[PDB]
Design a protein around this nucleic acid. Structure first.
Ligand SMILES: [Mg+2]
Ligand SMILES: [Mg+2]
Ligand SMILES: [Mg+2]
Ligand SMILES: [Mg+2]
Ligand SMILES: [Mg+2]
Ligand SMILES: [Mg+2]
Ligand SMILES: [Mg+2]
Ligand SMILES: [Mg+2]
Ligand SMILES: [Mg+2]
Ligand SMILES: [Mg+2]
Ligand SMILES: [Mg+2]
Ligand SMILES: [Mg+2]
Ligand SMILES: [Mg+2]
Ligand SMILES: [Mg+2]
Ligand SMILES: [Mg+2]
Ligand SMILES: [Mg+2]
Ligand SMILES: [Mg+2]
Ligand SMILES: [Mg+2]
Ligand SMILES: [Mg+2]
Ligand SMILES: [Mg+2]
Ligand SMILES: [Mg+2]
Ligand SMILES: [Mg+2]
Ligand SMILES: [Mg+2]
Ligand SMILES: [Mg+2]
Ligand SMILES: [Mg+2]
Ligand SMILES: [Mg+2]
Ligand SMILES: [Mg+2]
Ligand SMILES: [Mg+2]
Ligand SMILES: [Mg+2]
Ligand SMILES: [Mg+2]
Ligand SMILES: [Mg+2]
Ligand SMILES: [Mg+2]
Ligand SMILES: [Mg+2]
Lengths: 294, 159, 139, 169, 33
RNA sequence: GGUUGCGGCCAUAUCUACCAGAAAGCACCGUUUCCCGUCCGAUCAACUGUAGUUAAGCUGGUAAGAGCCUGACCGAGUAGUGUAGUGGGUGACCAUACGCGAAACUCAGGUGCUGCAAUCU
RNA sequence: GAGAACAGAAAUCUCCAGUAGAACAAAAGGGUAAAAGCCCCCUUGAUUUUGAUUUUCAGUGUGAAUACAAACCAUGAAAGU
RNA sequence: AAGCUCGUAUCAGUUUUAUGAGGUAAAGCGAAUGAUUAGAGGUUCCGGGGUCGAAAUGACCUUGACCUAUUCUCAAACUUUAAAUAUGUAAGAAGUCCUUGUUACUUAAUUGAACGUGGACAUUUGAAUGAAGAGCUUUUAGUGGGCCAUUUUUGGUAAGC
């Protein structure tokens, strides 16, 4: 387009921070998260990073260093098969699941886990996992939304309620839990609970095979071909929690081929770039090409 | 009439550098400051809270206090015929650590760690810095270096 | 310059502009030395020692006209101003030998009064579609 | 080559620039409503012009945004009126295109005198699948050059389906 | 309901834009007969 | 080595055009019951990961490409300046002595580096 | 810059560009782009108590400002403010 | 002026080393801004004066405006760059290291933050030079018209202004 950038323009142009270009960091709220009270010194602020890719859920407890942010421990939804969730791995329940996993998984490796049980009961209700006088204090973590909109009933606050239920003091309020009726200035513990066990994938599931045979065959091609009944759903999620509070400890993957291997193939689809003589050569020819006015 | 407002004459002093405007990076908030540290005052004109007075710009002092979002710097001002003591309450943006000092400690380590293998070899320490001394004799070689003698040039005009 | 040799025989260009404003108190009992900032009283052009004041380009043979035609201006300027024969081809840079090299090399392209040069720098694409004769077999 | 880089209407936008506030504006509003079956948006004056009759923040015009298969039918109902002929103008260099009609009763729609007759602007905007890249909050990027709507493209489109004429130069 | 389009731009001055000026027009113009 | 999440420094990273991209990933992409937001499920919310594609994003490669970064006895010991004289000159100004020393100009080189965590023929 | 009935230089609509060339009571200067600007939602931290501090300085007053302490509040999912 | 406390202290109208702050000189304007001479090329399909079939929502047009690449000249209240001279701080016993006490602050945490007990470190104990001794309290005279020269510099035509 004939709005080509003047050379003045390019020269006085001041670039944003790298990740401000990529649109991945809100450096405004980053600063206000990371910054510790100065007379608390080397005390790290710990962040509940909760990101949602298209097919996964990413949870990380992270702090900050000048040489770079440092992660205490990370859990993903894509782990959830291991604890018996193999469908709907980005829905609300997965979030609560993942939030609970990273809950245990951390203060396990902090050894705070025996004390600070969280809930186990989970009848869905607003409460903060707070401390036991004469004993230590709960591990404190601050929710880092990212760039996610703060909408009442948002997947991101699933992970929150998953994690607070896991026993991390992660300070929050209700009005973004599903079941918050603004007219009421209140919260339905019922609905909030439902989601935790996936009641909205359940109710929708039944309505489909009793409304639209084919459309249900596709949305849920998986559950069928796996014989998960519509209402075995809760027991899956319910049984996952067990399984999770059971062995939270991170098992990695088993990966064929070492780093060296993986490496020496993957970006040996690398375009290696020309060398000086070669490039000048490439150009010297380029001239004699166009050289001869036409 | 004359102006002597608090930020007068500071048009270039409290200006942000070329193509280095905007938001302040995070390394600044990640520095830890203890009492007794030596800092450098250098205002940041965008962060207008906790701002130093234009005087203290370019000065250097000791932290007598540490608070929520600011450090208390001591600076010795000269007023009249005699230095006085100024207590600054500045925000973390307007502060660096003094390299010159944050080295010194490393010489202290190293100077007192020459002392390590010093006694543990029984020999002489010899620590105090001694300044550049006159050269010692040399013997420059003529080999591949037959002095290439030069001479003044004529005058000439190129307009 | 004209009469003697012709409206088309030379290019005269004044190489300094009157940019500096001059002031007068203007002493119109009176007013005195009180409040003496002056009104603008005309402009002038600040000139260093060594600084070209007039420049002229004309045909190699019209030399003696211009000179004793710069001289006739010299007498209107306060101070010592020398007259000089520039060893460069015209109002350009480059000594007359060095200019003719870049002429029969094609690296020169008659512009508007002045002239554009071929660079070994830009986009080889339109370096060539700008300065054909450099790149064509020509002669 | 050419698979996921298909070619769709991004949206249609009907805009009646009434030129006054008051009953006429709320009447032209009624019209735009009965055509999209959505509820329309009113525009306020940018500034004042004596020789136009408006004063700043007087509510002059009204428009509506229609997307999807409805806008497809309404665009058809429109081209219906211009007898499937547009000019090589009408086509933004940036892929889009537009046209206008006077008398809205000319595309379906019964009379209703209590309403009156309004004319309108039909501006449809074109793009491709993948446009979200330039609209999403997180990781907002821009279309590839070899993608994105040129005018040649979305005029040779407009001859293809709809089967119409682009005229003039 | 009454729905109001929000004008992003930062201008407050009830004033015709630089892009006004009665110079530039036409000797032409639609003159119905 | 590729990729993603959170980063540090914040153009050697930006800009323009063109190409190429295995695998995983990211993605675009399917749907509107449900929480939630719109004039407009476009954005925002939720459901599926099922129906489809690397076209775009994204990552690289190309360019006597714009910009940006580094160097050089390239300009230049120039311009400017601290110190000395009962130095020169009618003066504007200049040179010398003990020292500091630029910018534009030109030329050559370069076009992201990297911390944590997860994952991948 | 390219486009849309009445619509003209100037009404309303869409797209592309756009480092700020806009805006932020005012003088000018500094500062600011997922803001410090524009739209919206919620509010009274423009509140309570007296001490420390920077500027002008005699290192008196005044005006103004900065960082804490101890309260009581506002707001946000929160860190925070 | 009176002294007082002490007696080589840690001082200094100085240099060095390390590391800060600065926007003047110069410079720049085919770099932002504001000025400024000149052509050249291209735009208008959207200011426009005609000629050509009054013809012109058709042409060749010189003229603007505007674009692009160039050219000459400037800035106390312009600027990317950017000196010289000046200017801040540091160069240890009030220090360093080890062990582990204190507390209501602080931390997920005997975690930190301060403040310490006990132990190890005395040749140059942490640059040069100097030190005619250092530190400290009280109290009171006169003064509170200044002028001159080198350089930097403002008003003025200028001035022994
Ligand atoms: Mg936010
Ligand atoms: Mg409801
Ligand atoms: Mg692995
Ligand atoms: Mg003044
Ligand atoms: Mg910026
Ligand atoms: Mg304030
Ligand atoms: Mg007066
Ligand atoms: Mg006056
Ligand atoms: Mg507005
Ligand atoms: Mg706009
Ligand atoms: Mg790697
Ligand atoms: Mg719905
Ligand atoms: Mg969608
Ligand atoms: Mg969404
Ligand atoms: Mg991306
Ligand atoms: Mg280049
Ligand atoms: Mg000198
Ligand atoms: Mg003398
Ligand atoms: Mg000289
Ligand atoms: Mg237009
Ligand atoms: Mg008040
Ligand atoms: Mg006495
Ligand atoms: Mg100044
Ligand atoms: Mg100058
Ligand atoms: Mg310069
Ligand atoms: Mg200029
Ligand atoms: Mg250039
Ligand atoms: Mg200046
Ligand atoms: Mg010494
Ligand atoms: Mg006295
Ligand atoms: Mg007195
Ligand atoms: Mg003297
Ligand atoms: Mg002097």
């Amino acid at each position: 387009q004939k709005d080509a950038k003047s050379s003045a323009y390019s020269s006085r142009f001041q670039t944003p921070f790298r990740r401000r270009r990529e649109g991945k960091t809100d450096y405004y709220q980053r600063k206000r998260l990371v910054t510790q009270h100065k007379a608390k010194y080397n005390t790290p602020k710990y962040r509940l990073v909760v990101r949602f890719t298209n097919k996964d859920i990413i949870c990380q407890i992270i702090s900050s260093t000048i040489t770079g942010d440092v992660v205490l421990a990370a859990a993903y939804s894509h782990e959830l098969p291991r604890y018996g969730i193999t469908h709907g791995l980005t829905n609300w329940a997965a979030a609560y699941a993942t939030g609970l996993l990273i809950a245990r998984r951390t203060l396990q490796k902090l050894g705070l886990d025996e004390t600070y049980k969280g809930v186990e009961e989970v009848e869905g209700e607003y409460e903060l996992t707070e401390a036991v006088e004469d004993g230590p204090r709960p591990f404190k973590v601050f929710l880092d939304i990212g760039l996610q909109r703060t909408t009442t009933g948002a997947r991101v606050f699933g992970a929150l309620k998953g994690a607070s239920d896991g026993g991390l003091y992660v300070p929050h309020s209700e009005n973004r839990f599903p079941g918050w009726d603004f007219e009421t200035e209140e919260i339905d513990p019922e609905l909030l609970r439902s989601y935790i066990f996936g009641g909205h994938v359940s109710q929708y599931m039944e309505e489909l095979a009793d409304d639209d045979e084919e459309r249900f065959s596709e949305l849920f091609k998986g559950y069928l071909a796996d014989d998960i009944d519509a209402d075995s759903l809760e027991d899956i999620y319910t049984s996952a929690h067990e399984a999770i509070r059971a062995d939270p400890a991170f098992k990695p993957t088993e990966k064929k081929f070492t780093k060296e291997q993986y490496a020496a193939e993957s970006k040996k689809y690398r375009q290696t770039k020309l060398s000086k003589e070669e490039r000048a050569a490439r150009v010297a020819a380029k001239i004699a090409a166009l050289a001869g006015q036409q | 009439g004359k102006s002597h407002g608090y930020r007068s004459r500071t048009r270039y002093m409290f200006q942000r550098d070329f193509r280095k405007h905007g938001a302040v990076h995070l390394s600044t908030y990640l520095k830890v400051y203890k009492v007794g540290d030596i800092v450098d005052i250098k205002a940041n004109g965008s962060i207008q809270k906790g701002m130093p007075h234009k005087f203290y710009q370019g000065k250097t002092g000791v932290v007598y206090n540490v608070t929520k979002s600011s450090v208390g710097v001591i600076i010795n001002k000269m007023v009249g015929n005699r230095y006085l003591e100024k207590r600054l309450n500045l925000r973390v943006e307007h502060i660096k650590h003094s390299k010159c000092r944050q080295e010194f400690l490393e010489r202290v380590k190293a100077n007192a760690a020459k002392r390590a293998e010093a006694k543990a070899q029984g020999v002489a320490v010899q620590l105090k810095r001694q300044p550049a001394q006159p050269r010692e004799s040399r013997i420059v070689s003529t080999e591949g270096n037959v002095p290439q003698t030069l001479a003044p040039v004529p005058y000439e005009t190129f307009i | 310059m004209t009469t003697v040799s012709g409206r088309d025989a030379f290019h005269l260009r004044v190489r300094v502009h009157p940019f500096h404003v001059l002031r007068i108190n203007k002493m119109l009992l009176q007013q005195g030395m009180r409040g003496a900032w002056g009104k603008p009283h005309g402009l002038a052009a600040r000139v260093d020692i060594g600084q070209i004041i007039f420049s002229v380009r004309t045909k190699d043979s019209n030399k003696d006209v211009v000179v004793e035609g710069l001289r006739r201006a010299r007498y209107k300027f306060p101070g010592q101003q020398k007259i000089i024969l520039s060893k460069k081809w015209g109002f350009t840079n480059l000594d007359r030998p060095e200019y003719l090299k870049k002429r029969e090399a094609g690296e020169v392209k008659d512009d508007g009064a002045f002239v554009k040069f071929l660079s070994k720098k830009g986009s080889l694409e339109n370096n060539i579609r700008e300065f054909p004769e450099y790149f064509a077999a020509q002669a | 080559q050419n698979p996921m880089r298909d070619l769709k209407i991004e949206k249609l936008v009907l805009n009646i620039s009434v030129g006054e506030s008051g009953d006429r504006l709320t009447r032209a509003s009624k019209v735009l409503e009965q055509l999209s079956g959505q509820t329309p948006v009113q525009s306020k004056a940018r500034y004042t012009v004596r020789t136009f009759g408006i004063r700043r923040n007087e509510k002059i015009a009204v428009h509506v945004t229609v997307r999807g298969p409805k806008a497809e039918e309404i665009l058809e109902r429109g081209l219906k009126v211009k007898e499937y002929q547009l000019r090589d103008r009408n086509f933004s260099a940036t892929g889009n295109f537009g046209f206008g009609i006077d008398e809205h009763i000319d595309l379906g729609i019964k009379y209703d005198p209590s309403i009156g007759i309004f004319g309108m602007d039909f501006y449809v905007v074109m793009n491709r699948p993948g446009a979200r890249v330039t609209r999403r909050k997180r990781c907002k990027g821009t279309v590839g050059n070899s993608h994105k709507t040129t005018k040649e493209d979305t005029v040779s489109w407009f001859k293809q389906k709809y089967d119409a004429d682009v005229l003039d130069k | 309901k009454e729905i109001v389009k929000s004008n992003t731009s930062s201008k407050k001055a009830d004033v015709p834009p630089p892009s006004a000026d009665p110079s530039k027009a036409r000797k032409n113009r639609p003159r119905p007969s």
